């Protein structure tokens, strides 16, 4: 997701296509007209570059970190792959 949703103002692409997309996405996820039948999933390696207005508790409320496992997880993974 960090390829089309960087902060608004940075990255002086002189085309002007990198702020219009962010504005459109923000206005579509949560705008004047209300939706109640959608779900959006995002995945990124650089969470510090995402726009701060896209992560507020009304747009992308759940944030999770997936990290290295411990012994009791490595055992489960090995069992899954050797069953």
């Amino acid at each position: 997701i960090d390829a089309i949703c960087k902060q608004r103002g940075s990255m002086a692409g002189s085309t002007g296509v990198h702020d219009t997309v962010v504005n459109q996405l923000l206005s579509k996820i949560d705008g004047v007209e209300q939706l109640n039948n959608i779900l959006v999933i995002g995945m990124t390696n650089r969470p510090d570059l995402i726009d701060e207005a896209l992560l507020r508790p009304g747009r992308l409320e759940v944030k999770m970190e997936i990290g290295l496992p411990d012994e009791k997880g490595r055992l489960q993974i090995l069992h899954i792959h050797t069953a």
């Binding site: 692409g13 002189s14 085309t15 296509v17």
Partner: protein
């Protein structure tokens, strides 16, 4: 860092016409005149056919009358 990028704009070439409004009107007028002439020819041809059909009966009647008269005269003569 002199790496520039661009975006494109489009223009539509004029649609196929601006020669279909001077010969077109003349074509339509000529077609209308030809249609009227064809209708008139239809009427005249029907009238002519009726007149020929009328002529046929008189033709046949005169033929029959002359043949009968000739046969009768020959029969009485001998």
């Amino acid at each position: 860092d002199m790496r520039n990028e661009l975006e494109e704009m489009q223009r539509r070439a004029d649609q196929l016409a601006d020669e279909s409004l001077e010969s077109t009107r003349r074509m339509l007028q000529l077609v209308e005149e030809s249609k009227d002439a064809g209708i008139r020819t239809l009427v005249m041809l029907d009238e002519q056919g009726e007149q020929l059909e009328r002529i046929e009966e008189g033709m046949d009647q005169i033929n029959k009358d002359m043949k009968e008269a000739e046969k009768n005269l020959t029969d009485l003569g001998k």
